[PDB]
Amino acid sequence: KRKVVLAEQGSFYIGGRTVTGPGKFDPSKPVIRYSNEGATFYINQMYVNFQAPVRPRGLPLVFWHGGGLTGHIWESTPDGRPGFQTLFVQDRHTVYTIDQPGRGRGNIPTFNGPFGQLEEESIVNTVTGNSSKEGAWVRDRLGPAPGQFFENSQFPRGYEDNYFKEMGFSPSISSDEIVDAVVKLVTHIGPCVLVTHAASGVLGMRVATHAKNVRGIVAYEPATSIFPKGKVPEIPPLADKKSQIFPPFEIQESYFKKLAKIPIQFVFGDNIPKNPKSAYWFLDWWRVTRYAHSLSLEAINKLGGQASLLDLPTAGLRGNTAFPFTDRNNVQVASLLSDFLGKHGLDQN
Amino acid sequence: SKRKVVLAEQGSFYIGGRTVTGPGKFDPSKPVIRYSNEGATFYINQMYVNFQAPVRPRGLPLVFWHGGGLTGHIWESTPDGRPGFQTLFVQDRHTVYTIDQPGRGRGNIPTFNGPFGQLEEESIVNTVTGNSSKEGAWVRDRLGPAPGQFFENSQFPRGYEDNYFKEMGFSPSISSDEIVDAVVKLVTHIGPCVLVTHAASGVLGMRVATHAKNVRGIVAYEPATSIFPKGKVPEIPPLADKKSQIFPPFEIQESYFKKLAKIPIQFVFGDNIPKNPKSAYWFLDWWRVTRYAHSLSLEAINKLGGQASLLDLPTAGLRGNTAFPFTDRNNVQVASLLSDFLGKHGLDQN
Ligand SMILES: COC(=O)c1ccccc1S(=O)(=O)NC(=O)Nc1nc(C)cc(C)n1
């Protein structure tokens, strides 16, 4: 189950720009301590890993981690079982995993001075934000409160520390520059399929509107909904009658229409309440966010698209968290992704 | 195929680190975003580890430890896309571990809700960062004497400068002790192994070996900081500018230093390090004196019964290497010399 035969593997950097400090560089002067004087800095580049099987079948898959994560989540589960990288190389796809700009091996743009500041210019904010273990526990629906599991949970219990250790902050790089890096990757790769997660859901939809090479999207538990500009439907507040979901992203209709040209599937796990749940903010947040996504998919289908919502419990899979691809039944989750690729001919040459 | 690799298993995991906490209590009924430090537990200073195991390994696993401001990428591929040491040594039938140390790459960057590195009133790491430039790295790594210039017969993959410099970045002010601790924990998990270090990780690997008997060997590429027993640092000259000095050598208690005499240790240097003072080129001169200090460090280990050696790649017939010989155009020949070291000491045998 763990063996993989690779025709080739490797990694590379793509995308980004440069920024420059004041003055000139003199090789005769002390180079340490490091200075911005005469300095060129490469910023906002992205790390890319690939593994290619012998005799690939169909399109390469680009796995795009969610918010605060890295390509680790596609390599292995917190308890050390094979991730989707291994499973889909075994399924004879070439597999790309990325660390987007600002995360993991992607660039974090900081210099000599307060975090993110290049002399007088703020490239990213000095003040950061970051989830806690407690916030991520309820965000990912391990259970209703930190330290508590849903009875049906597919989470790999006992490996909580390993799981939360994979998460971290992201600097305030513009989403435009994150999308730009992936568009450049998609141009380099050729026709491919994006597999996204949580925060990278909306970003992958945006990439598809810029990149005809994206031939399909599967988004696990996307966090932000997308609509044509000026056509955001009525979305209710949360059950506390104060909070809202993430403001939906709006794009010009001429770009939105490109989403109708490819098959798109959104995948949701379990324990999302059907009814208002004022006691558990993130459970209720997922209820309304999933509802908003259902309207987004409907809008795509009204433009001639083929956009679907897969609730894993309807396929017989119970208890999945917001990371179904690292849960205990992730082989069965992978099978459903293989089914989608096969239905749409994305596993054929 | 030279690119083909067959893995019995591969994967990655997190190891090491600690937790820090914010004030107060977490209420799941209250808005979770915007994120807060209230009732917050944060995992900090953990390390990322990737492993690739061949079918029927022979000899000890290798732990490849990137230099300063780098990640495990430098062992995966060269800047122009040729196989890195990870592939080459899985093909050489070693299980290969590649790490992103705490503070780098997939390792943790310890920051919270607030100014970078600050958790309420506690400074976990400094808000003010430092970072090399392209120009600084160019001369640090001896591509040439000045940015844009290359030494004659250079083995750098010319044309791929963007790729190369894009792999570099900053490191927050995590204590070296905590970085060493993570790797000690990894060595405990793996068992007997060999450390392959680089630049800034050189001194750290030496430290790890003094705390971990499972380190059975060390190969260090262009180490940046020298190591000596406490109070026994030899006289080391200043640089040719008569004002600068190399990195303050690390000093450790002699009981721990003596542990370095129990295992084979090889330091490996590339080309273009001057033999004579070079005031016009700071980093070239730095390397001259730094390599000299390392020669003395190795001698001290040998006087205590050790098996320490210095390999200058030009003496082995390899010209033009930079400070990253394992990503240079002749990195297959560099790998061959590492294979030779492992075979000499039986570290390629079960
Ligand atoms: C893996 O989990 C998720 O990706 C994920 C899943 C659900 C909600 C949030 C995230 S997150 O981690 O991305 N968190 C954030 O980034 N916070 C945030 N994001 C936006 C866009 C706007 C605001 C106000 N906050």
Ligand SMILES: COC(=O)c1ccccc1S(=O)(=O)NC(=O)Nc1nc(C)cc(C)n1
């Ligand atoms: C890949 O190249 C190298 O590793 C490498 C190689 C040679 C010199 C420096 C580095 S570095 O990048 O580590 N740069 C540093 O900033 N080193 C450093 N600087 C200070 C001021 C204090 C200490 C302890 N180390």
